[PDB]
Amino acid sequence: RGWFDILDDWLKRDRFVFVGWSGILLFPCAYLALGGWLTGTTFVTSWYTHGLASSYLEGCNFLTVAVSTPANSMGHSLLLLWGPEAQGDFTRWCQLGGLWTFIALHGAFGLIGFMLRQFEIARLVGVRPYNAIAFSAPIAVFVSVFLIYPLGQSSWFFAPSFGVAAIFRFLLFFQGFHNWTLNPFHMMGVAGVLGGALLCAIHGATVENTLFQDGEGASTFRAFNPTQAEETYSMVTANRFWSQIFGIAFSNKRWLHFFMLFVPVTGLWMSAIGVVGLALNLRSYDFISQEIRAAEDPEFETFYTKNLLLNEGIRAWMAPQDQPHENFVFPEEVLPRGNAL
Amino acid sequence: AELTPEVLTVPLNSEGKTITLTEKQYLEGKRLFQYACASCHVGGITKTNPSLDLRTETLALATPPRDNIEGLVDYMKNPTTYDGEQEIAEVHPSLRSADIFPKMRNLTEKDLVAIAGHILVEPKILGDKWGGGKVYY
Amino acid sequence: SYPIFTVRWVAVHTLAVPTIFFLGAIAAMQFIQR
Amino acid sequence: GGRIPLWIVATVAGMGVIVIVGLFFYGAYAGLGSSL
Amino acid sequence: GFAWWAGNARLINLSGKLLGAHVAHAGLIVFWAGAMTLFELAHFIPEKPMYEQGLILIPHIATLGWGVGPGGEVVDTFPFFVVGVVHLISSAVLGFGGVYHAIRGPETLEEYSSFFGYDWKDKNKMTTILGFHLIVLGIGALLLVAKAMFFGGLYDTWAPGGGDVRVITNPTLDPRVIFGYLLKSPFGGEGWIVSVNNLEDVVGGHIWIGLICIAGGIWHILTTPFGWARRAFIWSGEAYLSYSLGALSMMGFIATCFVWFNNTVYPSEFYGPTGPEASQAQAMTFLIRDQKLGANVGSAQGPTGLGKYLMRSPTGEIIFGGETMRFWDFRGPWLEPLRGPNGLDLNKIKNDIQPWQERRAAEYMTHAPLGSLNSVGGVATEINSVNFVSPRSWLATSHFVLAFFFLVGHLWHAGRARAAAAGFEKGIDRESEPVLSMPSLD
Amino acid sequence: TTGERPFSDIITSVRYWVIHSITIPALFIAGWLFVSTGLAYDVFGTPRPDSYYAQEQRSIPLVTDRFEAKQQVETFLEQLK
Amino acid sequence: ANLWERFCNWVTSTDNRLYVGWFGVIMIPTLLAATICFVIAFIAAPPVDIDGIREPVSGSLLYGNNIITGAVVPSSNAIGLHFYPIWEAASLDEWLYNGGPYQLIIFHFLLGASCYMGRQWELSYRLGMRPWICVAYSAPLASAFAVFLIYPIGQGSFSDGMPLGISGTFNFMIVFQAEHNILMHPFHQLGVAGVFGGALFCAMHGSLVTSSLIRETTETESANYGYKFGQEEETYNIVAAHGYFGRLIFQYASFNNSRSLHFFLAAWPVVGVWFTALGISTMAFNLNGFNFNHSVIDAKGNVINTWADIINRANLGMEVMHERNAHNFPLDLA
Ligand code: CLA
Ligand code: CLA
Ligand code: CLA
Ligand code: CLA
Ligand code: CLA
Ligand SMILES: C=Cc1c(C)c2cc3nc(c4c5[nH]c(cc6nc(cc1[nH]2)C(C)=C6CC)c(C)c5C(=O)[C@@H]4C(=O)OC)[C@@H](CCC(=O)OC/C=C(\C)CCC[C@H](C)CCC[C@H](C)CCCC(C)C)[C@@H]3C
Ligand SMILES: CC1=C(/C=C/C(C)=C/C=C/C(C)=C/C=C/C=C(C)/C=C/C=C(C)/C=C/C2=C(C)CCCC2(C)C)C(C)(C)CCC1
Ligand SMILES: CC1=C(/C=C/C(C)=C/C=C/C(C)=C/C=C/C=C(C)/C=C/C=C(C)/C=C/C2=C(C)CCCC2(C)C)C(C)(C)CCC1
Ligand SMILES: CC1=C(/C=C/C(C)=C/C=C/C(C)=C/C=C/C=C(C)/C=C/C=C(C)/C=C/C2=C(C)CCCC2(C)C)C(C)(C)CCC1
Numbered sequence A: 001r002g003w004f005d006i007l008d009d010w011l012k013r014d015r016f017v018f019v020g021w022s023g024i025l026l027f028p029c030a031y032l033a034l035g036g037w038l039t040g041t042t043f044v045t046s047w048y049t050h051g052l053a054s055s056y057l058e059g060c061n062f063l064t065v066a067v068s069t070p071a072n073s074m075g076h077s078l079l080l081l082w083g084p085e086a087q088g089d090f091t092r093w094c095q096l097g098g099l100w101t102f103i104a105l106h107g108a109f110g111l112i113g114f115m116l117r118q119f120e121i122a123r124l125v126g127v128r129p130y131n132a133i134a135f136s137a138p139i140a141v142f143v144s145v146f147l148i149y150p151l152g153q154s155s156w157f158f159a160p161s162f163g164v165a166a167i168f169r170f171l172l173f174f175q176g177f178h179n180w181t182l183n184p185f186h187m188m189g190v191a192g193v194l195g196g197a198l199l200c201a202i203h204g205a206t207v208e209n210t211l212f213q214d215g216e217g218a219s220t221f222r223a224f225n226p227t228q229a230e231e232t233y234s235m236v237t238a239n240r241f242w243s244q245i246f247g248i249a250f251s252n253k254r255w256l257h258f259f260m261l262f263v264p265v266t267g268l269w270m271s272a273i274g275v276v277g278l279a280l281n282l283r284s285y286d287f288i289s290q291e292i293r294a295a296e297d298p299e300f301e302t303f304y305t306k307n308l309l310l311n312e313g314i315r316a317w318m319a320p321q322d323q324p325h326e327n328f329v330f331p332e333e334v335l336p337r338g339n340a341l
Numbered sequence B: 001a002e003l004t005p006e007v008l009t010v011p012l013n014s015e016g017k018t019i020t021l022t023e024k025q026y027l028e029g030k031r032l033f034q035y036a037c038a039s040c041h042v043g044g045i046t047k048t049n050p051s052l053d054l055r056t057e058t059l060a061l062a063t064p065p066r067d068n069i070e071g072l073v074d075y076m077k078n079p080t081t082y083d084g085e086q087e088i089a090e091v092h093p094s095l096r097s098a099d100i101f102p103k104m105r106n107l108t109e110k111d112l113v114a115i116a117g118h119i120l121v122e123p124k125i126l127g128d129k130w131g132g133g134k135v136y137y
Numbered sequence C: 001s002y003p004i005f006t007v008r009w010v011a012v013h014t015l016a017v018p019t020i021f022f023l024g025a026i027a028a029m030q031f032i033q034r
Numbered sequence D: 001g002g003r004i005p006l007w008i009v010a011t012v013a014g015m016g017v018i019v020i021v022g023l024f025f026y027g028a029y030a031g032l033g034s035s036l
Numbered sequence E: 001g002f003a004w005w006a007g008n009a010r011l012i013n014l015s016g017k018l019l020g021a022h023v024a025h026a027g028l029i030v031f032w033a034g035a036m037t038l039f040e041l042a043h044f045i046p047e048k049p050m051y052e053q054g055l056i057l058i059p060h061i062a063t064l065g066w067g068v069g070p071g072g073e074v075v076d077t078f079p080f081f082v083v084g085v086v087h088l089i090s091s092a093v094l095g096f097g098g099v100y101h102a103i104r105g106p107e108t109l110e111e112y113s114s115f116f117g118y119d120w121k122d123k124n125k126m127t128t129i130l131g132f133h134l135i136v137l138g139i140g141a142l143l144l145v146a147k148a149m150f151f152g153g154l155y156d157t158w159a160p161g162g163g164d165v166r167v168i169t170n171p172t173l174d175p176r177v178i179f180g181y182l183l184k185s186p187f188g189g190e191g192w193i194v195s196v197n198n199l200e201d202v203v204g205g206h207i208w209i210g211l212i213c214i215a216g217g218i219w220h221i222l223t224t225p226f227g228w229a230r231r232a233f234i235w236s237g238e239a240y241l242s243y244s245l246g247a248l249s250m251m252g253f254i255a256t257c258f259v260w261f262n263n264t265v266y267p268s269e270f271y272g273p274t275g276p277e278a279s280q281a282q283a284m285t286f287l288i289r290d291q292k293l294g295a296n297v298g299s300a301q302g303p304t305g306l307g308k309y310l311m312r313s314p315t316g317e318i319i320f321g322g323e324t325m326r327f328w329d330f331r332g333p334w335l336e337p338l339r340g341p342n343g344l345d346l347n348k349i350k351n352d353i354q355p356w357q358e359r360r361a362a363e364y365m366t367h368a369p370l371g372s373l374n375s376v377g378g379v380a381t382e383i384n385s386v387n388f389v390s391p392r393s394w395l396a397t398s399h400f401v402l403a404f405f406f407l408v409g410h411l412w413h414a415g416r417a418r419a420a421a422a423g424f425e426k427g428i429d430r431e432s433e434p435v436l437s438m439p440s441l442d
Numbered sequence F: 001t002t003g004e005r006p007f008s009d010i011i012t013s014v015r016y017w018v019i020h021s022i023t024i025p026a027l028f029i030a031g032w033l034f035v036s037t038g039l040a041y042d043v044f045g046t047p048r049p050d051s052y053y054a055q056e057q058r059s060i061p062l063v064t065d066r067f068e069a070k071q072q073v074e075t076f077l078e079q080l081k
Numbered sequence G: 001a002n003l004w005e006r007f008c009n010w011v012t013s014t015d016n017r018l019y020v021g022w023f024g025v026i027m028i029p030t031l032l033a034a035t036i037c038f039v040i041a042f043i044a045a046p047p048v049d050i051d052g053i054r055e056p057v058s059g060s061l062l063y064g065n066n067i068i069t070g071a072v073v074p075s076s077n078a079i080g081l082h083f084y085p086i087w088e089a090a091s092l093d094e095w096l097y098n099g100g101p102y103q104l105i106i107f108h109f110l111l112g113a114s115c116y117m118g119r120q121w122e123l124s125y126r127l128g129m130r131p132w133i134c135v136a137y138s139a140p141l142a143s144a145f146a147v148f149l150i151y152p153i154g155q156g157s158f159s160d161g162m163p164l165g166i167s168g169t170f171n172f173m174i175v176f177q178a179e180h181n182i183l184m185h186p187f188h189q190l191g192v193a194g195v196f197g198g199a200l201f202c203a204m205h206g207s208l209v210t211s212s213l214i215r216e217t218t219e220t221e222s223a224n225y226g227y228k229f230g231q232e233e234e235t236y237n238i239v240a241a242h243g244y245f246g247r248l249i250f251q252y253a254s255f256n257n258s259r260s261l262h263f264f265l266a267a268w269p270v271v272g273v274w275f276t277a278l279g280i281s282t283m284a285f286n287l288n289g290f291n292f293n294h295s296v297i298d299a300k301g302n303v304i305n306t307w308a309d310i311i312n313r314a315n316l317g318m319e320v321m322h323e324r325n326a327h328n329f330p331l332d333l334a
Helices: A004-012 A022-045 A091-095 A098-125 A130-152 A163-180 A186-210 A235-245 A253-278 A288-296 A303-321 B023-036 B039-042 B057-062 B071-077 B109-129 C007-029 D006-029 E006-012 E013-041 E058-063 E077-102 E122-150 E173-182 E197-222 E227-232 E237-261 E275-290 E323-327 E346-351 E355-365 E391-422 F006-011 F014-036 F039-044 F069-078 G001-009 G023-043 G090-099 G100-126 G133-155 G168-180 G184-213 G238-248 G258-283 G305-319
Strands: B010-011 B019-021 E152-158 E164-166 E310-312 E317-321
Touching: A022 A098, A022 C007, A022 F039, A091 A098, A091 F039, A091 F069, A098 A130, A098 G238, A130 A253, A130 G184, A163 A303, A163 G305, A186 A235, A186 A253, A186 E346, A186 G133, A186 G184, A186 G258, A235 G100, A253 G184, A288 A303, A303 G168, A303 G305, B010 B109, B023 B039, B023 B109, B039 B109, C007 D006, C007 F014, D006 F006, E006 E013, E013 E058, E013 E077, E058 E077, E058 E152, E122 E197, E152 E197, E164 G305, E173 E197, E237 E391, E237 G133, E275 E317, E275 E323, E275 E346, E275 E355, E317 E323, E391 G100, E391 G133, E391 G258, F006 F014, F014 F039, F039 G305, G001 G023, G023 G100, G090 G100, G100 G133, G133 G258, G168 G258, G168 G305, G184 G238, G184 G258
Parallel strands: none
Antiparallel strands: B010 B019, E152 E164, E310 E317
C-alpha cells in the first residue's frame, strides 16, 4: 500500500468521467489539440504561411476557417515554441504556423491516450479489447495522412490544414496531383466506408423489423430490458427474409458483429497504405498501355484520358495560389483550356 | 492598405481635371453598380460581349474616351459603340432607354457619378482582376 | 450532502468557461467593418 | 433545490442559442466576410 | 400506445380533436399565404423584374392577370395587398375553429352528430366525405375557368406584343386535345402535361376536371365501393393517409418539372427564364453579336465540324449549336418568330431579328437559373456581386425535397397500415412465429 | 449513480443561477472586450483589415527562410510603418 | 384449385428459395434485361458520342479498356432527354453510336430496383414482419435515381447522367464539383456525416458486441461457434458493453436499450444518404454549394483569399478543361 498503489486507486475510481492512468496522457493532449484548433480558427491568420485569411476574426465563416500548415520554408520543423524558429515569441509562433504542429502532435498523443483508455477500461471491466483494436483504424489514417504524408514531401506545408474548406482543398489536390481516385487502396477504403454505412443501416433496420412483440404499446422501444436473457428480435425470421430477398443471409450473430468490425476497419487500413505511397508521389496515376495507344491514335478516348485532362486543369489553375512559395507565374497563354471556357 | 483619397481620385474629363470621390460615394457607386450593371459586368467584364471590358485602358481607347467621369456619365445616357458610330440605347441600359430598361428609371445624376466613380476606382484596387476574368478569380 | 467541486466540476468548466468567452469574442466580431 | 422548472431553463437557453447564431448569420451579410 | 414523438397518432379515433388539428393546420397554410405575400409586397420594387427579388407568390397572382399589364409591367400593387390581407384575415377564423375543436370542442364527433362523425372503416361515410371534397375541388377548378373567361382573363406570355392579359373566349373542349396531353410521352420533345403551351388548353382542361370532379363527387356520394375494391385496399385512417401521401408525392414531382420546364403557366417575365431558355438565349446572343460583326452564322463550321451557331437536331430541324443542342425542344415567345417549318430560318435570322429579341436574350442569358445556396448568381466559379437565385430553382428544389419525403412518408405509412391491419405492427408473436411453422428453404 | 450531483438538479437550483447569471455574462463581456479593445489582434499577430498589404503592395509577405523567418515577418510589419 | 389462383399462390409463396411476388414479376425481367445488356456493352459496345459532338468515347473492354477505365457511356447530348429505344433507330449501328444501351440499361435498372424495394415490403408482409426495411433501402435507391434520372432531367440531357463505369464515375464527380461546388453544399456534407458516421457506428457496434461475447468456446475454436442459429438467449452481455462504453465516454452517452441502439444504427446512415441524394437532386436544379469566392476583402478592397478561393481555383481548372471541344460560347449553363 504505497503511493503508487494509492494513486492507482484514485485514478481508477468510478466517477462520472473515468480518469485512469491513460487519462494522464489523454486529457491534457486532447484538450490542447482542441483548444489549439478553436483558438486558431477564432483568432489566427494564415497570411504569412499561406497568404490566406483563416479565422473568424478575419471574416471567415465556419466552413473557411482553418488552422493552416506552416510555411513550406519550415520544412518538417517541429516548430517548438522554444525552438529556433519562434525563439519563444508566442506571437511569431502563431504567425509561423506553430499551432499546426501543436495540434498535430498533441493530437497524436491524445489518440494514443484514447486507445490506452480503451485498453484500460476494458481490462478493468473484464471485456475483450476489440473496441481498442478497431480504433487502430482511425489512428492509421491520422498518422499516415497528417504525419507520414507530409514527412515524405517537402514540408508540413502539404499536409491537410485543420479546417472544412481546407480539407476540401486537400481532396481536390489529391485528385489533380496524385489521381488518388484511380488508386486501388483508396478504392478499398471507399468500399470499407460505404460497406460500413450499408452494414450499419441494414443491421439496424433488420433488428427493428424482426422484433418480437414483447410489449402492448405501439412504441416498441419500451419492451426491451437490458438484463433480459432473450434475443429481442428473431434471427430466424431475419435469416429467412434475407435469404429470400437477396439469396444469402447471416445465420451467426457473432460472425455478423465481427464482420461489422472487420469491414470499416480494414477499409481504413487499406486507404492508409495508399496515402503512405503518396507520401513518395508513388501514385496510381496512369495506365501505361492507355497512354501509348492514345499518343499514337488521336481518336482513342476513354474516361481515363478525360479525367487526366481535368487533373491537368486543376494543377495549372490552382498551383500558383496553392503553393505561393514556388512563385509560379503562368501567363494566360500557357493555361490549359478547352474551347470557349 | 486602405481606401485613400489618392485612390478615390479619378479623372473628371479628358481635359485632365480630377475629382476626389468620398468613401460614401465609392460604396454608393459599388452598390448601384451591383443593382444596374453587374448582371452583365460582374468584375469588370461583359458577359454578353466578352470582347469589350471595363478596364481603364479599354475605356481610354473608346470613341469618345470613356476613362473619365464625363465620358461614363454620358455613356450611361446615350451609349454608343466603341468607335462612336452608332447609338445603342435600344440594347444597352441607359437613361435614354429607361422605358425599356426600367432599372435605370430611379437613377439620379449623382447616382451616375457614383457608378462611374466605382468603375474608375475598382481597377486601381483590384488590378488585373478588374475586367480580367476567371483567370484572375 | 453532495460534493460541489469534483473531477466532473473541472471537466465541465474546463470547456464551458472558454466557450462563453469565445462566444463573446465572436459576437463582437460581427460588428467589425473594413 | 429544484426551483426553476426545467422547461423554463430550456426555452431561455433555447432562445439564447437562436439569438447568438442569428447574430453569426447576420454577420455573414455585414462587415467582414460579406463580399462588400 | 404511442410515445410523445408519435403523439399525433393519439388523434386517429378522436374525430373532434382531429378536426381541430386539420383546421388549425389549414390556418397555418392561409396565414403563410397571407403573411408571405405581404412580406413580398412590402419588399417589392416594380422597376426590377420579379425574379431578381425572391418572389414566389406575387408571380402566382400576376399570372392570374391581376396587377399587371402588357409585358408583365406591374400597373397596380393593390391586388397583391388585397390577396395578402384576405388570406391573413381568414387564417384567424381557421385558427379559431382549429383551437376550439382541438381543446374545447367534443373530443369525438360521432355522438354530437351522425353527420360529421365518422368511423374510418365505414366505407360509405368515407366515400361521401370524398365526394364532398371532390365537388369542392371541382368548384375550385371552375373558379379559375371563371376568372379566365368572365373576370378579366389571365396573363398570356404568348399574347402578340410581348404578353398581356387576355380573356379566354374559346377554351379548348376537344377531348382529343385535352386528354391527348395525358398520353404524350414524358420524355424530351413531348413532356406529358408539362408541355401545355397555350391558355385555351389550360382553361379547357379545367372545365373538364371541374366537371369530372363534380361528377365523381356525386358518384362517390351515391355509391359504396364495389367488392373488388373492398378486397384490394386497407380500410383505415393510416391507410388513407398513406394513399394521399403517395398522391401528394407524385403531384410534387410533377410540379417540380412544371416550374422547371413550362414558360406558359409560369411565364418567364415573372419567374425568370427556364434552364433551357437561358441556354438558348446565350446561343442567340452570340449569334446576334457575331453576325452584326459580319459572321455568316449559317455557314460557320465549329471546332468539332458541327455548326458553330446552327446545326441539325437528330430529326433534321435547324437548331442552335453548342451544348444547347440538348435544348432544341425549347419554345418561347422571343424565339418562335424566327422559326420556320424546318426549324430556325436562316433568312429570318439574317434579316428579322429585333432589338426586343436581342434584349430578351441578353436578359435571360444573364438570369439563367444557376446560383449558390447563399444566393450568389451565376456558375459556381463566379465571384460574389450578383445576389440572385432564380425562383424556378427555389421552387424546383423545395418541391423535389417535399415530394421525396412524402414518398418516404407513403412507404412508411402504407407499410405500417398493412401490418397494423394484419396485426403484427408491434412485432412477432414469439409463441406463433410464422417462419417457425414454415418448411426450411433448403 | 456515481455520487456527483445530478445535472438536472443543478441548473434548476436557485443558487446555481444566482452565480451563473453573473459568471456567464462576465465571460461573454471579457471575450467581447478581448476583441473590441484590439488585444486579440496583437496577442496573435493577426492582421487588421488595413494591414494585409502596404498601400501600393500586392505581394503577399510570405515567409521564405526557416531560421530568419522571425526576422522576416518583423521586416514586413515595418514595411507598414 | 383454379389456374389463376394457383399462379397467384406460386407468385406469393414463401416456399420459393427466392421470393418472387408481384413486384418480383416486374423486377425479374427488367433486371435481366438491364444486366444482360450491360454485360454485353461493357465487353463489346463500340465507342459512343456521349457529348453529341461526333467525338466518340470508347468504353468497352474489346475497344481498349480495362476494368477500371471501361464504362457503358451515356447517350448523346444530341438526344437530350428524348426517349431512344432500339426501334427509334435506323439500325443497331446507329443506336450503338449514339449510346442507346445506356438508356435501355438505366431505365430497366431503375424500374427493377424500385421493384426491389417493393419486394422488400411484400415479403415482409408475407412473413409477418414489421415493414420498414424497404424504407432503409429507399436511401440508396434515391441516390441512384438522382445520378441516373433527376440530374439529367434538370440539366436537360442523359449525357450528364453518371456513367456506368469506374473512371466514368470519377469523371461525373469531378465535373459535378466544377459546376456545382458540391463539397461546399450542406447536403453533401450531411452525406459524408452519414457515411463516415455509418462506418464509425458499424465499427463501434461490431466491436462492442464482439467485445462482450460470453465465453462459450475454447482458445482452439472460433468464438463464432458459441452462437447457434435460432438459440433463444442473447450471445453477448449488453450490460457489460454498456458498462465499458459508458465509462469510455460517460454513462449517459451510451445505450442500454438494444432497440433504440439498433434504430439509431439504422437512422443515421439512412438520413445522411437521403440528404446526399437530395443534394444531387437539387443541384440538378442548380441550387449549388455555398459560394464564398472573394467574400473577404481588406480596407482598400484587396481580395484576401481564403481556402474557398483555393477551392475555386481547382474548380476553375476542372471547368475549363472538361468537355474541352463541346462549348462554343463562354458560359456552361448546363
Ligand atoms: C502531459 C501530457 C503532455 C504531453 C504528452 C505533451 C507533449 C508535447 N507538448 Mg505539450 N503541454 C502540456 C502537456 C503535454 N504536452 C501542458 C500541461 C501544457 C500547458 C503548459 C503544454 C503546453 C505545451 C506548449 C506550449 C508546447 C507543448 C509542446 C509539446 C511537444 C514538445 C514537448 C517536449 O519537447 O518536451 C520536452 C520536455 C520533456 C520531454 C520532459 C522530459 C522529462 C525529463 C527527462 C526530466 C528532467 C528532470 C530534471 C533533470 C531534474 C531537475 C534538474 C535540475 C534543474 C534541478 C510535445 C508534442 C510544444 C509543441 O507542440 O510544439 C509544436 C509547445 O510549443 N506543450
Ligand atoms: C400542426 C401541428 C400540430 C397540430 C395542429 C397538433 C394538434 C394536436 N395535438 Mg400534436 N404534436 C405536434 C404538432 C401538432 N399537433 C408536434 C410537432 C408534436 C411533437 C412535439 C406533437 C405531439 C403531441 C402529443 C404528445 C399529443 C398531441 C396532441 C394533440 C391534440 C390535443 C393537444 C392538446 O390538448 O393541447 C393541450 C395544449 C394546451 C392547452 C396548450 C395551448 C395550446 C394552444 C393551441 C396554443 C395556440 C396558440 C395560438 C397562438 C393562439 C391562436 C388563437 C386564435 C386562433 C383564437 C391536438 C389535435 C395530444 C393528443 O392526442 O391528445 C389526445 C397529445 O397527447 N400532440
Ligand atoms: C371543415 C371544417 C369544419 C368542420 C367539418 C366542422 C364541423 C363542426 N363544427 Mg366547426 N368550425 C370550423 C370548421 C369546421 N367545423 C371553422 C372554420 C370554425 C370557425 C369559424 C368553426 C367553429 C365552430 C364552433 C364555434 C362550433 C363548431 C361546431 C361544429 C360541429 C357542428 C356544426 C354545425 O352543426 O354547423 C351546422 C352548419 C352551419 C353552422 C352552417 C355554416 C355555413 C358555413 C359557415 C358556410 C361554408 C362556406 C364555405 C364552405 C367556407 C369557405 C369560405 C372562404 C373560402 C372565404 C361540427 C362537427 C359546434 C360544436 O361542435 O359545438 C360543440 C360549435 O359550437 N365549429
Ligand atoms: C381524390 C380522388 C379520388 C379518389 C381517392 C377516389 C377513390 C376511389 N374511387 Mg373514384 N373517382 C374520382 C376521384 C377519386 N376516386 C372521380 C373524379 C371520378 C369520376 C371520373 C371517379 C370515378 C370512380 C368510379 C367510376 C369508380 C371509382 C371507384 C373508386 C374506389 C376505387 C379506386 C380504385 O381502385 O382505383 C384504382 C385504379 C385502378 C386499379 C386502375 C387505374 C388505372 C390508371 C390508368 C393508372 C394510371 C397511373 C399513372 C401513373 C398516372 C398517369 C395517368 C394516365 C391517364 C396517363 C376508391 C374509393 C370505384 C368504386 O368502387 O366506386 C364505388 C369505381 O368503380 N371512382
Ligand atoms: C399529411 C402528412 C402526414 C401526416 C398527417 C402524418 C401523420 C403521422 N405520422 Mg407521418 N410522415 C409524413 C407525413 C405525414 N405523417 C412524411 C412526409 C414522413 C416522412 C419523413 C413521415 C414519417 C413518419 C414516421 C417515421 C412516423 C410518422 C408517424 C406519424 C404519426 C405521428 C407523428 C407525430 O406525432 O409527429 C410528431 C412530430 C415530431 C416528432 C417533430 C418532427 C419534426 C421534423 C422531423 C423536423 C422538421 C424541421 C423543419 C423542416 C426545420 C426546422 C427549422 C427551425 C428554425 C425550427 C401521425 C399519424 C409516426 C407513426 O407511424 O405513428 C403512427 C412515426 O413513427 N410519420
Ligand atoms: C472524420 C471522421 C471521423 C471523426 C470525426 C471521428 C471521430 C471519433 N471517432 C471516435 C471513436 C472511434 N472511431 C471509430 C471508427 C471510425 N471512425 C471513423 C471516422 C471518424 N471518427 C471511421 C470512418 C471509422 C470506422 C473504422 C471507432 C471504432 C471508435 C471509437 O472507439 C471512438 C469512440 O468512442 O467513438 C464513439 C471518437 C474518438 C474521440 C477521441 O479520440 O477523443 C479524444 C480526442 C482527441 C485525442 C483529440 C484528437 C485530435 C485530432 C486528431 C486533431 C485535431 C482535430 C481538430 C480539433 C478538429 C478538426 C476539424 C476540421 C478538420 C474540420 C470520435 C468521436
Ligand atoms: C492553444 C494554446 C493553449 C491552449 C488553449 C486552449 C486550451 C483553448 C481553449 C479554448 C476553448 C475550449 C474554446 C471553446 C470555444 C467554443 C466555441 C466557440 C463554440 C461555439 C459553439 C457554437 C457557435 C455552437 C452553436 C450551435 C450550433 C451552431 C448548432 C448546434 C447547436 C450549437 C448550440 C452547438 C495554451 C494556453 C496551453 C498555450 C499554448 C497555446
Ligand atoms: C392545436 C395545437 C397546436 C396548433 C395550433 C395552431 C396551428 C394554431 C393556429 C392559429 C392560427 C392559424 C392563427 C391565426 C391568427 C390570425 C391572426 C390573429 C390574424 C391577425 C391579423 C390582423 C389583425 C390583421 C392586421 C392587418 C391588417 C388588417 C392589414 C395589413 C396589416 C395588418 C397585418 C396589421 C399546437 C401546435 C400549438 C400544439 C398543440 C395544440
Ligand atoms: C387540368 C388541365 C389539363 C387536364 C388535366 C386532366 C384532365 C388530368 C387527368 C388526370 C387523371 C385522369 C389522372 C388519373 C390518375 C390515375 C392514377 C394516379 C391511378 C393510380 C392507380 C393506382 C395507384 C393503383 C394502385 C393499385 C394497383 C395498381 C393494383 C391493385 C392495388 C391498387 C389499387 C393499390 C391539361 C393537361 C389539359 C391542361 C392544363 C390543365
